């Protein structure tokens, strides 16, 4: 028995339900990824920009001493430079999805600047490489290798 007939989108659109869930329809993959970036910027834009800035190695520069220890941690482990390398090292097709995702964030911000908090505006525009960078910090330098385990410190988050 076959699965149900897949739906084939004929136009690019987000249908949001009553709980703020985006259903992103794209005519191809870069379109859907752009819609996803747009939706994420709408629902979570400030904190995504803050995190992207941190993964650039620029948390101290953008927001000061509260962000300084993470900056030292990431620059010392080469995260921002390595992210650019992972970015260049992507397959063409997937790289195009990452550029689209980032373009979606940029577009949301550009069209709704009232919705972006002042202290994160300096982060824009974001790139495919910022997306790769944040995922790298998250997987390898928050989950696998936490700064606490290396520096001999207290509990994980911060509170």
């Amino acid at each position: 028995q076959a699965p149900i007939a897949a739906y084939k989108p004929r136009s690019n659109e987000i249908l949001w339900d009553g709980y703020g869930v985006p259903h992103i329809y794209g005519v191809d993959a870069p379109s859907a990824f752009y819609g996803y970036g747009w939706a994420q910027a709408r629902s979570h834009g400030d904190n995504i920009l803050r995190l992207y800035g941190e993964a650039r190695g620029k948390g101290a520069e953008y927001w000061g001493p509260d962000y300084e220890q993470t900056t030292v941690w990431l620059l010392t482990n080469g995260v921002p430079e390595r992210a650019q390398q992972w970015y260049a090292q992507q397959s063409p097709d997937f790289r195009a999805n990452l550029d689209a995702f980032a373009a979606g964030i940029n577009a949301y911000a550009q069209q709704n600047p009232d919705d972006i908090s002042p202290d994160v505006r300096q982060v824009l525009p974001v790139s495919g490489a910022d997306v790769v960078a944040h995922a790298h910090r998250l997987m390898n330098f928050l989950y696998v290798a936490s700064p606490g385990r290396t520096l001999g410190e207290g509990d994980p988050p911060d509170l």
Partner: protein, 522 residues
């Protein structure tokens, strides 16, 4: 976090079931989950992911779905260096450091930035840090040469078949996590995933601690492929699970033992009571419907009470203190469930804090210790009933101080509050046996506490045709100031009233409240 996958043979209708159930902070920004649905002509994915990720971590569609829990894959080594003469000692010689003078900018109170020097030193191990205690530590992280993490995950969740999924997984570009899988063809799988260095010697505890950084003997250079790592596919027991336990009871009956794997991959420590319940809830139930699967997920048993109260109550009724005796009777009358209406649960938590430490993981107070031979019925009993009663005397004081009485209703102190919605809580600490988890905060000045961690994204999927799925997100789908979609789900959580997840176009068209047309030109 919890994860269940159930084979068709274990269900009423003959379709596999899947549970997505991440437990993480309700506040930490990079741990925030976001629900979404993508559709193109060539793929479909529905699910939740951490904000800023362009791929859905907890994904499913009409064909398949996966979920994750944390396995602690030891993918990095911290080496203790021995400093000598401006270098570091290594294989009997002083080896000089690699070093660049980098720099970064730091924003000041007045809005300007100054440049700050940053020396980056590296040994053969990797980059070097100085701990506050003056210890020089080099961190060597594995899989820095794996750029394909996001694409692997994307190819996994859009896989057209289990084989395509395995091929993607086998690229070893996702450096950690337990990953559980299921599909409409009837396949279920558990994998203890990540990028683990090949080591010639030493157990996991050795490799989690500071490894000697003075010898090439401890310098690994290669990593394990997928087929070296613990995995289970379509086992005889008809299900798989992981609740952050070591991967030694991922199903029942088991299909491997610890001796079949190098000892550094995973610990061999007592399984938490939540994990013991995970195994029981699946193993003991047959002919499952989606509905009974959902009901099982809500489990909130004080398993620790079952293990301790038989011995603790009698010993406590011997004591001359009338407050101790009354606390013993209040506890004995309790059904041992973390319900809203429980007058005994809070007091129990306070006793267990001392009997088993603040984490509830301490094993020293038990009469019978944990055994892999009896993995879901140990540890058991109270070793020193007299001391446990003194622990109860203290817990009585602590409970009155914290909450105002020894018999305050669980759900009157335990609340879930977001914006202006304020609802009664239920379930609780995983290490006390609660499968559904809310890691309650310390109480405020009025004895009210809320979740710091636990249920976030919860979804349960039946791979029927079409698929049927239900879900909830504790803190809603948005955190942007002013949104209506932050506190608009927590009430439903308090009643376990799950949303139907809408994958089909016609369902989405009936539920739509906002259309955003976009267009992309690169």
């Amino acid at each position: 976090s919890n994860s269940w996958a159930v084979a068709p043979g274990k269900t009423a209708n003959g379709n596999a079931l899947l549970l997505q159930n991440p437990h993480l902070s309700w506040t930490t920004d990079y741990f925030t989950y976001y629900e979404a649905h993508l559709v193109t002509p060539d793929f479909e994915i529905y699910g939740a992911t951490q904000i800023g990720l362009p791929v859905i971590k907890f994904a499913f569609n009409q064909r398949m779905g996966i979920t994750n829990t944390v396995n602690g894959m030891v993918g990095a080594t911290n080496y203790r260096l021995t400093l000598q003469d401006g270098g570091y000692l290594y294989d009997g010689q002083v080896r000089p450091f690699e070093r660049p003078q980098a720099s970064y900018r730091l924003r000041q109170a007045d809005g300007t930035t100054v440049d700050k020097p940053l020396e980056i030193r590296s040994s053969v191990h990797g980059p070097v840090f100085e701990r506050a205690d003056g210890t020089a530590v080099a961190v060597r992280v594995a899989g820095l040469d794996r750029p394909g993490m996001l694409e692997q995950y994307f190819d996994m969740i859009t896989a057209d078949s289990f084989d395509d999924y395995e091929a993607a997984l086998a690229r070893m570009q996702v450096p950690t996590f337990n990953i559980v899988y299921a599909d409409r063809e009837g396949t279920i799988n558990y994998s203890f995933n990540g990028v683990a260095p090949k080591r010639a010697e030493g157990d996991i505890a050795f490799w989690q601690g500071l490894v000697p950084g003075d010898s090439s003997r401890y310098l690994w250079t290669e990593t394990h492929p997928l087929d070296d790592l613990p995995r289970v596919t379509n086992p005889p027991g008809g299900f798989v699970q992981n609740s952050n336990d070591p991967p030694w009871t991922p199903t029942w009956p088991v299909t491997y033992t610890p001796k079949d794997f190098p000892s550094y991959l995973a610990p061999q420590t007592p399984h938490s009571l939540r994990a013991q319940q995970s195994v029981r809830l699946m193993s003991e139930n047959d002919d499952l419907t989606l509905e009974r699967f959902m009901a099982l997920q809500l489990s909130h048993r004080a398993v620790m009470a079952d293990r301790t109260l038989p011995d603790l109550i009698p010993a406590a009724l011997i004591d001359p203190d009338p407050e101790v005796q009354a606390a013993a009777r209040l506890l004995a009358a309790w059904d041992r469930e973390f319900t809203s209406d429980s007058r005994a649960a809070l007091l129990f938590e306070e006793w267990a804090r001392l009997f088993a430490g603040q984490n509830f993981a301490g094993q020293a107070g038990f009469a019978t210790p944990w055994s892999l031979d009896k993995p879901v019925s140990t540890p058991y009993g109270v070793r020193d009933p007299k001391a446990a009663v003194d622990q109860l005397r203290t817990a009585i004081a602590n409970t009155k101080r914290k909450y105002g009485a020894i018999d305050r209703p669980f759900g009157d102190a335990s609340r879930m509050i977001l914006n202006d919605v304020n609802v009664p809580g239920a379930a609780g600490y995983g290490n006390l046996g609660s499968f559904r988890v809310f890691t309650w905060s310390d109480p405020d000045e009025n004895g009210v506490r809320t979740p710091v961690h636990g249920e976030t994204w919860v979804a349960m999927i039946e791979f029927s045709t079409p698929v049927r799925a239900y879900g909830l997100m504790s803190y809603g789908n948005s955190r942007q100031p002013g949104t209506t979609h932050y506190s608009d789900q927590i009430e439903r959580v308090s009643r376990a009233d799950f949303r139907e997840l809408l994958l089909r176009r016609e369902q989405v068209e009936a539920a739509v409240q906002e259309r955003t047309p976009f267009n992309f030109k690169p």
